[PDB]
């Protein structure tokens, strides 16, 4: 809420989580942002946390399991494309038809055009 003007946020669907992880996913290995290419690297990085495959990674993020903090902190912040931010402009709240603020489940339409 404090940083509302600078961010838009909402609640993702499962399909949104999968596409972001599969297409834009990455891990911080040895301080290097290595993109996800195999289950071997996911097992190497997160094997201690009982996450040995990419589908374990997706399930943990979506359901927010016990090891969410360790799993989420290993995931590098996704780099997204551009898309139509708002109807009027991003200087007003989405409730007013603007760009920032809490979009709730409507954030999945924006993420569809940005992934």
């Amino acid at each position: 809420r404090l940083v509302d003007p600078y961010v838009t946020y909402g609640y993702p669907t499962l399909e949104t989580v999968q596409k972001l992880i599969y297409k834009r996913g990455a891990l911080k290995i040895n301080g290097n942002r290595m993109p996800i290419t195999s289950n071997c690297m996911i097992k190497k990085a997160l094997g201690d946390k009982d996450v040995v495959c990419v589908d374990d990674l997706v399930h943990e993020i979506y359901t927010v399991g016990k090891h969410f903090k360790e799993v989420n902190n290993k995931l590098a912040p996704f780099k997204l494309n551009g898309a139509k931010i708002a109807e009027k402009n991003k200087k007003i709240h989405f409730i007013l038809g603007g760009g920032f603020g809490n979009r709730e489940l409507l954030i999945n339409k924006l993420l569809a055009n940005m992934i």
């Binding site: 599969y22 996800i36 290419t37 195999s38 289950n39 495959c53 990419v54 589908d55």
Partner: peptide, 9 residues
């Protein structure tokens, strides 16, 4: 690549 990452495909 999808099979390599997700054999359940």
């Amino acid at each position: 690549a999808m099979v390599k990452l997700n054999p359940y495909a």
